[model samples]
Target chain A: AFPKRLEYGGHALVWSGDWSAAGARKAIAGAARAGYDYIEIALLDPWQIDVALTKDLLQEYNLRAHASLGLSAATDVTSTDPAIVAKGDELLRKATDVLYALGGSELCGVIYCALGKYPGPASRENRANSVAAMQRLADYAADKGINIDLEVVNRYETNIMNTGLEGLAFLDEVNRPNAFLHLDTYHMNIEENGMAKSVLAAGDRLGYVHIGESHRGYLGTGNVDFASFFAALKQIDYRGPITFESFSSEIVDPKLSNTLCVWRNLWHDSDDLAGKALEFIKQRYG
Target chain B: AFPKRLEYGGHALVWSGDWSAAGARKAIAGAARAGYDYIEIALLDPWQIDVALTKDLLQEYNLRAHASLGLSAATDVTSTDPAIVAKGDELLRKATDVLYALGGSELCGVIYCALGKYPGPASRENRANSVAAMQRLADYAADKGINIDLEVVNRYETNIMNTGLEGLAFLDEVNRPNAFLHLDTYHMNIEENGMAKSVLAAGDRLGYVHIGESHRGYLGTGNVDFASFFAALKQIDYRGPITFESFSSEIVDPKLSNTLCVWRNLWHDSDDLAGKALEFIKQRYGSHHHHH
Candidate 1:
């Protein structure tokens, strides 16, 4: 296997912290001590995040910063309500401002829609509203040097974008150069016919990646085809931040832990889990 | 919407019991009261089932019977070892005998392989062993008038056959008239490119159906496109048992609940779940249905 070393990033939830002034210091230092090149902040409420403290902590630990978040019911751009769409636009604008203040260049996760299951199919209006919002967000972030990475989740999470084909179509509609596809192996394993093929299809538009197992546990312990996934990444010459995204009942986020169905206690020791993931990923991608 | 009245079946797990003599009586009676045409027995261990008790309960409830089970690691037909394959063959053969004893004509679920996440891809030998075992099992059950329905599950459950195309290919290799494809909406929602297209592809080979939601809870509450799924079924003129399969942490099967990731408490009342499912199906498929 040819080693093409990647910039390894760790999820904020992987460490035990709330990302407060003190929490950010511990989380940033924890990620750094775990051999992570950077830390992906869980910017759920951008207003609650102290940008000065976050930037100071990241610099203190010698770690780069990248952030991710999902919209709420009141702020879902996919809603037919104009008021909700405006709130969605406002929320994303604030998030971009926060990321910019923290000196992060990329924002990922379910930015287009709320991260929850819908009772029915997404209507044409819903899709149009989301596309419009993404365009606005991309335009807003472009001058700030922040890229909008739309993470393609599973069917249960969002109706608009489930597979690579659906995500690529959404990207084309947005038609913004900074707006790109954010793929996760956990969702890909469930939705894609083949994981590696989806990577090849995304090609250059693949802005950020989240390396998660099928069960969102320890790497290489589940059904995810990492060998082929890494080989495809190599084929695309993907020299980007490959972050390890994992969740468990052990480290709960109050709302996210339930929304993502992190009911099972897959693992307890965060240090052990993060350490193993870094080694496992390096053995394959490095 | 065109309505085609079809036979509705209830899964055994819907009832609150361990499936003993009293458990069987309550389960069968519950299914009958819930308006299910038949009951699908969770045949995890065939040897533990009392054939006479099961047959009497089905008769008393005026319900037909169908059984389903997954193979264990020691009894996985997909294993490369001859001993494991032999055990798998024995298990399925015994399960077929039990189904026959209970007057059931259909057996389903992950019979070809153990229903668990694999660390790696299936080897060529593992697949070949499974194919050979299925053929033998089909031949063994043919004379007993039992149909082997291979339920195509998600990739996490089995590597060999996760999609309809893969299931169809496996069926071709077995080349048995009795073996057919069993389509489940829950798995299809996660794995298939399009649920309706998969059903259309299965066609006449689609022998059995499991109607489950995206979350394995209430039907319309999740994201499963039941309208299109039922429409596809009507298009194929599929006249077979359509069973409701739902799982939750409230009513747990020691092994199955964990394997299928039934971690959430989707629902607590079995009577309500089964009754709601029957009405949901009849509203979509009944000949007397009216569209608003």
Candidate 2:
């Protein structure tokens, strides 16, 4: 039995093809049928999504919707260009508005920096720019009773925050009540010394969770250390929304699929994969 | 006081920019000066390298040479197309000829399949084609007294062989006497459950080794269990070349660099990195063997 405080969710791509109106309906229905309390929408291009239709679908399905996205180079807040930073600020602000319209309260992902491999390390100015932008986004989301979760991704995807401790430091600089650490097991497998220790370190600051296997395939098939990860969640008394994130070439998004390197078809049946994952999380977390 | 049977090597990219004649001479002399016994030339294009010049540089430096390269999609043996398979055979054969001309006796890398992420799993027919091609290459290399090593890379690089056991299974299908498994700690860190255990499983079949960190940076800095890896090599009594491989975007090769995803500049100074790795391996493997 899963805890009441802990709500399980599945990413949009787990059930649907894309963020089109029809796909939104399918994802909402699939998530509701699969016994997920919520469905996390990948707000890659926030404006492209039909807000009214998505809102109605979530309500009809009786499911909560949370949104997350990664920033592009053109809209990366950490850039020195004032225009780029402004675009980032506008992007997250718009995403927060869309999520609020869908009755969601969490906006998570790689919002601080561009979601691609950086050739060099982040300078002090980059961190300052990122923190300032995050602070503004946090303040904007807080008004709508929403939380901004900073998803710590892999080294190849980010140069800013790859670990829990690094994320906590950035969150501290943001100094907002709503902004919290979002840890993914896939990245932890690459960057963390110990996965459980990372969760324990995040402790109270941990807001959102993305449970992905090392290869982003069927649960327990890859080496992600889920038992230890969940045990850490228990140790930290984490009661945040746990979202299952996975991708394959079978379900492709033009931008995200390529960026995440979803070259291999890890699984074919989305319904089976999603249902099995829900069971996988409940069995471990409960 | 390393064993006479054992050889220490560095990848060509570890010292030089490209495989031009000047770059080959630099890599050869750098390997020699850095106390490496041999240098593994990345025969990416095979014909682009000057065999005569490389042979002279190796001879002048008193160093040995080994060659390796990954097959491109157009030259993949695992393809259904006979023309593509023929191209794969020709590519490896050409590489063998070049290595032979440079006095090298070992050829390695992801030669069985095209070195890129595949959209789906490899079919049985694909494996059969790959095995057939590898068998021919093995026979060809055997004539030249050279070994063919199948570098078991990660899933992204080649779906054919990601683990030592997988490599061994494919090697069994090829059933060649000289063909052996080439293991890299960097790929093993991602794909293998136990890094040392992989080496131990390979045993005598492990012909070549690549010592790279988890992040492909300084030795022992990343999460790679080098102590256990080196211990496993010793357990297998591995006397083959132990090559140090690290890549940074600073030294860019057009094709190979992108395939390996060398986006981060892990380190700046190649000389310092290579020298430190030589000492790292020597210290772990032992300058002198101790009685147990």
Highest lDDT: which candidate?
2
Q: Give the Å shift of residue B101 in candidate 2.
A: 2.9
Clashes of 2: 0
Best by TM-score: 2
**Candidate 2 C-alpha lDDT tens digits along B1-292:** 1122478888888877688877888788777777888998987688788787788788888899988788999899999999999998999999999988877788988889998666566778898999999999999998888888899887667767788888999998999888999999877776665667678888888988888877678887766677778888888888887889887666757466666655446688877899999999899898855458
Local accuracy by lDDT, each model: 0.82, 0.83
lDDT of 2 at A196: 81
> Residue B230 of candidate 2: its Cα lDDT?
86
In candidate 1, position A155 carries an lDDT of 60
Q: What's model 2's lDDT at B252?
A: 50
Each prediction's TM-score against the native?
Answer: 0.56, 0.74
lDDT for residue A192 in candidate 2, whole number 0-100:
71
Candidate 2 Cα RMSD (Å) = 5.8
| DockQ of all predictions against the true structure, Cα-based | 0.04, 0.16
- iRMSD for each candidate structure, in the order shown: 12.6, 4.9
